[PDB]
Design an enzyme around this catalytic site. Sequence first.
Site, short mmCIF file in Angstrom:
data_model
loop_
_atom_site.label_atom_id
_atom_site.label_comp_id
_atom_site.label_asym_id
_atom_site.label_seq_id
_atom_site.Cartn_x
_atom_site.Cartn_y
_atom_site.Cartn_z
N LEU A 43 0.65 -1.41 -0.23
CA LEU A 43 0.02 -0.06 -0.17
C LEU A 43 0.77 1.05 -0.08
CD1 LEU A 43 -2.77 -0.99 2.29
CD2 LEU A 43 -2.77 -0.85 -0.29
N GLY A 44 1.94 1.49 0.91
CA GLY A 44 2.90 2.26 0.97
C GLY A 44 4.21 2.23 1.46
N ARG A 45 4.94 2.89 1.27
CA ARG A 45 6.36 3.03 1.59
C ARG A 45 6.84 3.92 2.27
NH1 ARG A 45 11.66 1.50 -1.68
NH2 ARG A 45 10.91 -0.30 -0.87
N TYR A 48 9.94 4.83 8.18
CA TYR A 48 9.95 4.25 8.72
C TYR A 48 9.27 2.43 8.90
CZ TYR A 48 11.40 8.24 11.44
OH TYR A 48 11.82 9.72 11.54
N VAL A 51 4.28 -0.75 4.28
CA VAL A 51 2.97 -1.07 4.55
C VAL A 51 2.01 -2.10 3.39
CG1 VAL A 51 0.31 -0.27 5.19
CG2 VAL A 51 2.06 0.96 6.11
N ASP A 154 1.67 13.87 14.98
CA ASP A 154 1.92 13.24 13.56
C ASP A 154 0.75 13.74 12.94
OD1 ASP A 154 3.19 13.12 11.16
OD2 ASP A 154 3.26 10.83 10.91
#
Length: 328
Positions: A43-45, A48, A51, A154
């Site tokens: 899904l994403g990078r 840290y 995902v 965040d």
Amino acid sequence: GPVPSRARVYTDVNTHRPREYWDYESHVVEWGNQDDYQLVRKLGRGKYSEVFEAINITNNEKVVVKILKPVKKKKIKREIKILENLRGGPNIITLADIVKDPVSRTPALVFEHVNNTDFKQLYQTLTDYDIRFYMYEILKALDYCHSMGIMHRDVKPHNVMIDHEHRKLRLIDWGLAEFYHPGQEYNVRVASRYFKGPELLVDYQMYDYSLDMWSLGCMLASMIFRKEPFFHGHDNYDQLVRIAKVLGTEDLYDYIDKYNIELDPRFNDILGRHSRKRWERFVHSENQHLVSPEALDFLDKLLRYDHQSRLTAREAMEHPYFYTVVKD
Ligand SMILES: COc1cc(/C=C/C(=O)O)ccc1O
């Protein structure tokens, strides 16, 4: 030296909690079975972590797996302990499991799946009612984690996952979250640039939950004025200048003078002199249906230089802006 500061609420939550609650370095991780989860797509990078969407093969249900990149065992345990402390809380993403990934040789966090609309397109379609509704839902999550002695640090659109079909919201990515302890100095290198509070931008380390309320105000401004992000700085210095062109430079100087803070001298040539503006100047024919006197007053009370002056999450939930939101 700088004048000390304390949260005006939930100041001593962690003090009176058992040590086990906030001492995350001593936390012993309970490991699940890694073979329960089959990765389906990336899904994403992030900086840290990576995902993934995955399937829990013990119930054939979609989940999300966050494989942590190699970072301090301290920070890994911090995120894990905070997620376990907050589990079950209103609109807090649910940590379902923790497993050892055999390829990364790091912990993989397993979350409930949120069938979301990405914030680029959703913000295009949110109604006045939608914005009030989802803001209230975010406040439930923030008052909960603040009441539990934790600041998120965040808050940004990316980290507020919304399933618009079921009108369900989850606050995610607790990887920067921290325990609030009175008098503790914190890293100012947190939050995304556009959502960084003035305390971070002037290097004031003794901050608290109220940081999240600045970030929330930035999100609100972007939603009701249809300008994402609202304060659009080119770097962390220009970010403070962008803020000062709206809130004004005299109240910036009042802020740093109150805490006996000095600005970076590099601001001498870029900051200038700016009046405080009225929020009405950002209203135009393409956003006016999202703006009301209540919205502007609420926004005005979130976006204060002085972190001690901002609405708390609970105070925010009392605001007239939310009177039209259906409660049940
Ligand atoms: C990207 O989609 C998701 C992300 C998460 C958690 C991310 C994090 O905590 O860092 C949880 C559920 C999701 O559906």
